[PDB]
Design a protein around this ligand. Structure first.
Ligand code: HEM
Ligand code: HEM
Ligand SMILES: CNCCCc1cc(C#N)cc(CCc2cc(C)cc(N)n2)c1
Ligand SMILES: CNCCCc1cc(C#N)cc(CCc2cc(C)cc(N)n2)c1
Ligand SMILES: C[C@H](O)[C@H](O)[C@H]1CNc2nc(N)[nH]c(=O)c2N1
Ligand SMILES: C[C@H](O)[C@H](O)[C@H]1CNc2nc(N)[nH]c(=O)c2N1
Ligand SMILES: [Zn+2]
Lengths: 409, 413
């Protein structure tokens, strides 16, 4: 059936037909919705229909469905799966696939940029040193002296499951976290466990609040190896406030490059277990989640002190006041340092425009309202009032297990 | 369906286990291929449809009072079936009515205030026959619930649906709301959300003051008849002038709001019986007024005016001038209610209470249906504990349901 989605602020109604194309599950059923669950829920025979489906939509996308090239490609892939239990994507197909996995990422508010993605083919990589080289080039390219460019580097696909390429870091660039004798945490508490694995492997920790973690890289199923990213490739921003001159004295900084490195890219049945991808930050990612989450840097109280706020009752909204000033500081700092960043008002605006584009040209746009709506000031951004349909389209980015739970040394 | 579903809290790592979802009775709107979790809204019962619905409810009631399988349970079942057989409907006992109303609230997945569910004053108005009688009952409800500012949650329940042509309806979506007036120049005076209803009232005879905060009259339909207008006695309408503890100029914006949130357009469904007029009221969470009523672009839309008086830079969105004004507006709302000693709850306190409620329900009941999209407040979401809490949404009965607007369906006599 055709599905309507309405914006309750503009009263614009869009019609979704694209959802009929989905074949994978969402996790919900007719009687139970799991819209707020973070993580809900090959062989030659499974492999061909998936490959065919993907080849079909690729050739449909270049207006040559059923062409001679198309027929030949299907045949070629058929033979290759027969003979080898897998197949290799053409360069054009790899790039199409990566851009579309981004396009189909229902949890990403930044998708208006989807067709501008620099794709680095790293499928000839065989070793951890090789991976390091490719990752450095990625970081250097994507960083671009502050003028951030979206990029993805794609390492060899899964074969038997015992020879996986994995970036063990959840992101390429992150700050270490340390468990103190007194039981508190120094640095980022989210990375305490990963930091410990790096230490256990030989990494000598400076034990600061913002120590960039080393890369831990696994090539072809082997034990991961440590590498320090050359520091001149790591762009950082000292956080200050345009009004509160005491803010710089908090000693806060963050890195300019958000680069997810723990997801799995799926294209036509093939699985790319190492595919680090990067864009640029939305201010709230740092200002709200990284700094103000209770389980992260957790700075609200200190900031509220410096602002001399009344902090005895919740109803003074001291937390909300402090939260806003921190996010002003993040945006101001990045902007003043000419490092690409987008505020949640601008980002959500662009996303609404993107939705409108996709509905017109594609017949829909899968979107996860729980993730799309920013973690502050929700209803004063346009996505809060936008109905969205969530469904799973392929090619796609998928979660995968942490490598330290499925690896034998 | 799996017998046990797990929900995680990503802040605390606490894992809870849901079994209550197995009692789900109606569709969410989702399927295994699509989720409609952010969709707002995704001829009577026949004898044969009614039997198992009544039995399911009666069983639940007698199970709740630890008399399941008792002689009184079996007798009540037989009496109910006999009534359905002879009359195609049945009547609830007062005890069952009260149980059903409290459970419809307990089951309302979109409500963050459910920690209070077992404390609800239920007014049985099933003997009501006329619009004048409806008015009396509604006035008594408003006075009781308001309690001079110490608000008490309450529901008044009018006669259930019979053949569908004799419905009792409150035409107002809430008992107390402000009028909206569209101007010839395209501007709106008052609350833009209420323009349609306001036009209906005017057509029905209401003389409008044409102000920014005019309390709408009640439009009351009894027994399927044409609806009639009544003015709520102004002394029964508690209102709060909004001022700010720091900004002396804030009171000069001339804002105020009413103290009692009272939903009057929902259908209460118990044991297959449908109560099409069941106005219920509680007390406000500040953000309902400070974020939605005042700051929605399609409502009073005051962010700009507040921003200008705050001397904020408003040329770039990146200054977060909107977020800054939003916080000060919400501070003022909470400060004004507390000062006038009218019950209100801030979004931090309410969401903290809701998490405790949810944990208790998982413990004692096997679960707690919750709609995250609605439970998370419209500002500062992730600094409230609910943002980090996975929730399962499913529909249990007794329940409050949406129903079409009466002016779209009414047959004018
Ligand atoms: C270019 C600027 C971009 C912006 C402003 C942006 C914005 C965001 C934000 C704010 C999130 C939520 C992150 C969180 O809360 O953890 C997100 C998630 C996501 N993004 Fe984007 N993004 C960008 C680029 C990209 C690119 C280049 C890709 C892939 C090629 C991508 C794919 C994804 C995926 C798969 C998620 C979901 C992550 C998860 O489920 O943990 N994004 N994005
Ligand atoms: C006692 C204090 C109460 C508080 C603090 C509270 C809080 C809330 C809030 C903030 C909402 C969201 C409203 C919106 O965004 O439009 C809501 C919705 C709702 N509440 Fe509660 N409420 C209370 C009492 C009650 C009572 C007494 C009932 C019924 C007996 C009730 C049933 C509902 C229902 C059915 C909804 C969904 C409304 C809809 O879908 O439009 N609540 N509540
Ligand atoms: C359930 N969440 C687990 C953590 C995942 C994650 C953590 C951080 C941090 N710090 C930062 C990110 C970056 C997400 C992202 C990715 C991209 C590509 C762009 C952008 N603006 N943001 C992700
Ligand atoms: C899609 N939403 C349409 C508007 C529904 C609604 C509007 C207002 C207002 N103004 C006020 C309410 C009151 C909701 C409510 C009800 C109760 C019982 C308590 C409480 N704190 N809040 C509802
Ligand atoms: C429980 C809930 O699903 C979880 O907290 C989600 C909520 N929405 C989110 N939205 C974004 N963008 N990122 C997140 O990590 C989360 N966390
Ligand atoms: C599109 C979206 O479902 C809609 O704007 C919802 C979002 N969450 C909400 N949450 C509450 N409490 N009240 C609302 O009106 C809404 N509106
Ligand atoms: Zn769903």
């Amino acid at each position: 059936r055709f599905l309507k989605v309405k914006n309750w602020e503009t009263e614009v109604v869009l019609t979704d037909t694209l959802h009929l194309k989905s074949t994978l599950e969402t996790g919900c059923t007719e009687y139970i919705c799991m819209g707020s669950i973070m993580h809900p829920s090959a062989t030659k025979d499974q492999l061909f229909p998936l490959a065919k489906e993907f080849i079909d939509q690729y050739y449909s996308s270049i207006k040559r469905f059923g062409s001679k090239a198309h027929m030949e490609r299907l045949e070629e892939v058929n033979k290759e799966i027969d003979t080898t239990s897998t197949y290799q994507l053409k360069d054009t197909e790899l790039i199409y696939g990566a851009k579309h996995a981004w396009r189909n990422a229902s949890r990403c508010v930044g998708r208006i940029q989807w067709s501008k993605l620099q794709v680095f083919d790293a499928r000839d990589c065989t070793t951890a040193h090789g991976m390091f080289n490719y990752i450095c080039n990625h970081v250097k390219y994507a960083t671009n002296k502050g003028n951030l460019r979206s990029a993805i580097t794609i390492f060899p696909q899964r074969t038997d499951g015992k020879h996986d390429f994995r970036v063990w870091n959840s992101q390429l660039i992150r700050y270490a976290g340390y468990k103190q004798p007194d039981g508190s945490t120094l640095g980022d508490p989210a990375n305490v466990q990963f930091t410990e694995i790096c230490i256990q492997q030989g990494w000598k920790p400076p034990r600061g609040r913002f120590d960039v973690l080393p890369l831990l890289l696994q090539a072809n199923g082997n034990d991961p190896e440590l590498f320090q990213i050359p520091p001149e490739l790591v762009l950082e921003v000292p956080i200050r406030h345009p009004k509160f001159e005491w803010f710089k004295d908090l000693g806060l900084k963050w890195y300019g490059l958000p680069a997810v490195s723990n997801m799995l890219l799926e294209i036509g049945g093939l699985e790319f277990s190492a595919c680090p991808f990067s864009g640029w930050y939305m201010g709230t990612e740092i200002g709200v989640r990284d700094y103000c989450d209770n389980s992260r840097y957790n700075i609200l109280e200190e900031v509220a002190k410096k602002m001399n706020l009344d902090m005895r009752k919740t109803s003074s909204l001291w937390k909300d006041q402090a939260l806003v000033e921190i996010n002003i500081a993040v945006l101001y700092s990045f902007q003043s340092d000419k490092v690409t960043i987008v505020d949640h008002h601008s980002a959500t605006e662009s996303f609404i425009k993107h939705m409108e584009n996709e509905y017109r040209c594609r017949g829909g746009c899968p979107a996860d309202w729980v993730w799309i709506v920013p973690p502050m000031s929700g209803s004063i951004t346009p996505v809060f009032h936008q109905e969205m349909l969530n469904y799973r389209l392929t090619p796609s980015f998928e979660y995968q297990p942490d490598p330290w739970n499925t690896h034998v040394w």
